[PDB]
Amino acid sequence: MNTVPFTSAPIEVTIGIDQYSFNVKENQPFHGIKDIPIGHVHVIHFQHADNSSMRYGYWFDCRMGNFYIQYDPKDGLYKMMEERDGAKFENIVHNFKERQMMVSYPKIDEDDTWYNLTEFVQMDKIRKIVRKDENQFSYVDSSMTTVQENELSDPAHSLNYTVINFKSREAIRPGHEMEDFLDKSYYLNTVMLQGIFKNSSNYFGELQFAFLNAMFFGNYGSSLQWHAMIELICSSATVPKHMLDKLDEILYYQIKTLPEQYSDILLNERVWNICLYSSFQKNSLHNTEKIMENKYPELL
Amino acid sequence: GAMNSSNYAELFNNDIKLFVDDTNVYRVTVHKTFEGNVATKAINGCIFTLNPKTGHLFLKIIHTSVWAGQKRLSQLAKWKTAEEVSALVRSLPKEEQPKQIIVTRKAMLDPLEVHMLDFPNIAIRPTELRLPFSAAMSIDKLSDVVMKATEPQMVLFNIYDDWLDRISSYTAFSRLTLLLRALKTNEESAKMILLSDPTITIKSYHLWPSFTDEQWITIESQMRDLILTEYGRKYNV
Numbered sequence: 348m349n350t351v352p353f354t355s356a357p358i359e360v361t362i363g364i365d366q367y368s369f370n371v372k373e374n375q376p377f378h379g380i381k382d383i384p385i386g387h388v389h390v391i392h393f394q395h396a397d398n399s400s401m402r403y404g405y406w407f408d409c410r411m412g413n414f415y416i417q418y419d420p421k422d423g424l425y426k427m428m429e430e431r432d433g434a435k436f437e438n439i440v441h442n443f444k445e446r447q448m449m450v451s452y453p454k455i456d457e458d459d460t461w462y463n464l465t466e467f468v469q470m471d472k473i474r475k476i477v478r479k480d481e482n483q484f485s486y487v488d489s490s491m492t493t494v495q496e497n498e499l500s501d502p503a504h505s506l507n508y509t510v511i512n513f514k515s516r517e518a519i520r521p522g523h524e525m526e527d528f529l530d531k532s533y534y535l536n537t538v539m540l541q542g543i544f545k546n547s548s549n550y551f552g553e554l555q556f557a558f559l560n561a562m563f564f565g566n567y568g569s570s571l572q573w574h575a576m577i578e579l580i581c582s583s584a585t586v587p588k589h590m591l592d593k594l595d596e597i598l599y600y601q602i603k604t605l606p607e608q609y610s611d612i613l614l615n616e617r618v619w620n621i622c623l624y625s626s627f628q629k630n631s632l633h634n635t636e637k638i639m640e641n642k643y644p645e646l647l
Numbered sequence: 648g649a650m651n652s653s654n655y656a657e658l659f660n661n662d663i664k665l666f667v668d669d670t671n672v673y674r675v676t677v678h679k680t681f682e683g684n685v686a687t688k689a690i691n692g693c694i695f696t697l698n699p700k701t702g703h704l705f706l707k708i709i710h711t712s713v714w715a716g717q718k719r720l721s722q723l724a725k726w727k728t729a730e731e732v733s734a735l736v737r738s739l740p741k742e743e744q745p746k747q748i749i750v751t752r753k754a755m756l757d758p759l760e761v762h763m764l765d766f767p768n769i770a771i772r773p774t775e776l777r778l779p780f781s782a783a784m785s786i787d788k789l790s791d792v793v794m795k796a797t798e799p800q801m802v803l804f805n806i807y808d809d810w811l812d813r814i815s816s817y818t819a820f821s822r823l824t825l826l827l828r829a830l831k832t833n834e835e836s837a838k839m840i841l842l843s844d845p846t847i848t849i850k851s852y853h854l855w856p857s858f859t860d861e862q863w864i865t866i867e868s869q870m871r872d873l874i875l876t877e878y879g880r881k882y883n884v
């Protein structure tokens with residue numbers, strides 16, 4: 348069980364650790380989060396009490412180093428940093444633990460929610476979507492735009508998701524125009540799976556990471572990416588049976604976690620109705636269709 | 648974006664454009680089977696592709712053989728239309744290729760856009776106008792060449808005959824759409840108007856009769872009466 352200590356909490360901020368969130372008051376004696384499950388990526392994210400504008404956060408994996416948070420009064424945010432001195436870090440954490448100034452990552456033993464949301468998400472792939480090679484962790488916030496958004500402006504601060512575009516020469520084989528537009532199997536399986544992602548695990552990892560950025564930081568271009576990757580599968584007539592089964596599980600837990608209030612803006616009516624009721628895979632997402640109908644029957 | 652009343656003079660500027668109408672591509676008769684079920688029999692169709700400035704009509708005849716063994720023909724017809732339009736563009740010299748293509752039905756947008764991905768600078772546009780191009784098959788010589796085709800064929804016409812020698816392309820398009828609106832609302836009456844006077848003929852190389860300017864005003868007036876008439880016979884006014 349790993350620890351992310353905080354130097355201090357100079358400003359009142361709502362702190363999040365994956366699906367969990369808690370409130371810290373201005374200059375409250377808070378020194379971090381302990382008992383963080385090893386083996387999963389994590390995201391520590393924040394929303395300032397004074398400026399609910401710009402929810403932001405850091406993706407990280409405790410196996411890749413010792414990380415801590417420190418408020419920067421010049422740039423005005425909680426920053427993640429790496430501590431390279433291992434004995435300094437152990438001594439810091441042990442003191443803060445001895446004085447009980449840390450919250451416990453509050454995981455219920457039965458609960459596989461986080462695993463199910465991050466099953467295919469790897470830090471090494473996150474760091475190629477979010478390019479900042481001098482850090483082991485990755486910053487994301489509400490406002491960051493995607494490579495594809497920028498095509499339609501600062502490249503260093505972009506989300507470099509895989510561009511998907513259904514009316515593009517990449518998606519449409521010369522001479523197979525109608526076939527490929529109406530059945531996206533060649534784009535999914537040859538272009539994207541075999542060519543770009545290499546396997547369905549990397550595909551699902553990007554899909555899951557896009558959903559999580561969409562939900563946690565309201566990142567609009569992330570939501571576009573998550574829906575595009577679902578729609579590309581649902582609009583393919585030929586999908587490996589194991590992918591369809593895994594997709595149903597993936598989406599089921601996303602819809603189960605997505606707070607009820609965010610559905611208005613995040614869920615795209617057209618994609619979901621097309622996917623559950625019109626598409627080739629209309630009959631292949633039993634768990635997802637059941638929770639969508641029982642939770643959000645208005646959308647549909 | 649979409650083409651409407653407000654940007655209507657854009658049709659007659661010097662940027663090459665084409666209207667594409669797909670209504671008459673997939674044409675069927677519906678009939679009863681010996682067992683009392685219903686069945687369709689296709690007949691020859693056509694793509695109606697028109698330069699509104701010059702009057703040049705690229706009439707691609709769609710022979711019924713293109714549907715043989717195919718499913719979901721109404722959907723295929725849109726993609727076949729888009730395939731043929733894209734082939735026509737690639738066949739033209741660069742300086743003759745259109746800068747815009749306006750489709751008369753919004754369901755042609757995605758099929759044409761996908762077939763034209765190689766031409767990213769050609770704008771594919773819808774329109775809010777309710778243009779009467781479906782009545783093209785009420786023009787005897789166009790109907791005749793479509794029905795006699797035994798194979799796929801492209802036939803080139805000028806749908807304005809020699810009108811542009813005497814009138815502008817705005818006026819010629821207005822005359823065309825009025826003739827076609829009339830032929831669409833009451834074909835028999837429309838054709839009676841056009842051929843009532845045996846002394847006015849259709850030249851071998853034309854589609855419409857050789858009216859003087861004064862006879863065209865008479866004709867144009869009679870067509871507006873018909874359209875208002877039928878509009879009353881329809882709504883009782």
Ligand SMILES: CC(=O)CC(=O)NCc1ccc(C)cc1
Nearest residue numbers: 361362363366368392393394563
């Ligand atoms: C700091 C923080 O957590 C602010 C916040 O409310 N973020 C959105 C959010 C959080 C948790 C879940 C499960 C979904 C959306």
